């Protein structure tokens, strides 16, 4: 039974490793999501996961896939440590307050509490990362930043510290949607599998249900995710509000534009969760018995 320090460090390392491994998927998702917002005179058009990744690699370099990676890693540290700490102090509290089972509702409550605090803590990282991922020299929009820390310094000096928390409420709404949809869909699909006994309750049912629940969460949070990416990436004054950005997306690009980057998003989610789970378990066991 690992100590708190082992949990914190293993969560940080596993989350950071999954982040560096699956970061090109996130960059592809951001590129697909900001595509269509502004017309481009270049022939470069992003379509698909491999298509977007290869287009970015061949027109901007391999290093452009990891644009904003230090921001992503800082978030991962904050989110992983905060997840462990608040998981303890909130879920133990929920189970011990009335002495009941770890229901679904308690999992929603703890997940939203932890995710809200994590979103607020890591919003500046996420703003910097989205802006660095979205910026390009090919589509007529001048890049604002040279790198992560340049982006921090410029945004803080020319937009205020509040400017580092732009898009906090879309991020929060998306985190709520992902958490609730994953939990509900996973439980429903598993107990649908079992209420029939369609598949064996070993790992494969869990894998299938987590796959389906992750896709369902990605699809449910995709409109919020596209609007969040476009709003956060936007310079001050372009969008009066977040619903203003959503309404412009709807009127000028329609409903399918709310699902841009859906395949990269789902692949990013699934692969990141798998990598972090395996790495986190291995690190916990190793530091528990090194």
């Amino acid at each position: 039974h690992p100590t708190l320090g082992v949990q914190l460090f293993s969560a940080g390392i596993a989350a950071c490793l999954a982040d560096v491994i699956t970061f090109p998927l996130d960059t592809a998702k951001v590129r697909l999501q900001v595509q269509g917002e502004c017309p481009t005179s270049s022939v470069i058009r992003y379509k698909g996961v491999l298509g977007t990744i290869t287009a970015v690699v061949k027109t901007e370099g391999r290093m452009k896939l990891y644009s904003g990676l230090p921001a992503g890693l800082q978030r991962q540290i904050s989110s992983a440590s905060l997840r462990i700490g608040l998981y303890d102090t909130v879920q133990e509290f929920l189970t011990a307050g009335k002495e009941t089972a770890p229901s679904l509702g308690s999992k929603i409550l703890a997940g939203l509490t932890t995710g809200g605090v994590a979103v607020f803590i890591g919003q500046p990282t996420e703003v910097v990362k989205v802006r660095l991922q979205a910026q390009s020299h090919l589509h007529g929009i001048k890049p604002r930043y040279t790198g992560t820390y340049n982006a921090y310094r410029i945004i803080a000096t020319t937009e205020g510290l509040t400017g580092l928390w732009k898009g906090t409420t879309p991020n929060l709404m998306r985190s709520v949607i992902i958490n609730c949809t994953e939990l509900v869909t996973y439980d429903l699909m598993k107990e649908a599998f079992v209420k029939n006994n369609i598949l064996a309750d070993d790992v494969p049912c869990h894998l299938v249900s987590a796959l389906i629940a992750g896709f369902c969460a990605t699809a449910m949070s995709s409109p919020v995710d596209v609007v969040k990416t476009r709003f956060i990436n936007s310079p001050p004054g372009q969008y009066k509000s977040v619903p203003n950005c959503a309404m412009k997306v709807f009127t000028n690009e329609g409903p399918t534009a709310f699902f841009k980057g859906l395949v990269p998003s789902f692949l990013r989610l699934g692969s990141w969760n798998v990598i972090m789970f395996v790495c986190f378990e291995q690190l916990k066991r190793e530091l528990s018995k090194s």
Partner: nanobody, 121 residues
Framework: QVQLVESGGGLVQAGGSLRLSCAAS????????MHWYRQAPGKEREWVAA????????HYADSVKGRFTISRDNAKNTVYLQMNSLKPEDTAVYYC??????????????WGQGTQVTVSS
């Protein structure tokens, strides 16, 4: 009931200037990108310019860039095409355009009646 009304076209010498207006009515212009097209007889309708919902970006056809500018006043529901150094090749009917995408498979095009611009030589 979308209505786009173009005005400001006329007959001008080559190298002259002309400011076209599009009065837009029956929709919330603040959410819609606006476009200027042109069609001359014996040619297809050519996209000229596009402006963002609030004027954040503006893009042009290569044949009109630097000569034509596109502008908005969402308060007056008006879109403007300033046309400078006009050449006889710019003689066409100029059309204001709104692509309403909304709850559709592809965008629906709304057009004005067009204003004729003739450049003399």
């Amino acid at each position: 009931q979308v209505q786009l009304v173009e005005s400001g076209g006329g007959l001008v010498q080559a190298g002259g200037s002309l400011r076209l207006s599009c009065a837009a009515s029956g929709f919330p212009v603040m959410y819609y990108n606006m476009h200027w097209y042109r069609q001359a007889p014996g040619k297809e309708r050519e996209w000229v310019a596009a402006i963002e919902s609030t004027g954040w970006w503006a893009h042009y056809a290569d044949s009109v860039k630097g000569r034509f500018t596109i502008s908005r006043d969402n308060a007056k529901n008006t879109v403007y095409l300033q046309m400078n150094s006009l050449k006889p090749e710019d003689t066409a009917v100029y059309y204001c355009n709104v692509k309403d995408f909304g709850w559709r498979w592809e965008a629906y095009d709304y057009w004005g009646q067009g204003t004729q611009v003739t450049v003399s030589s």
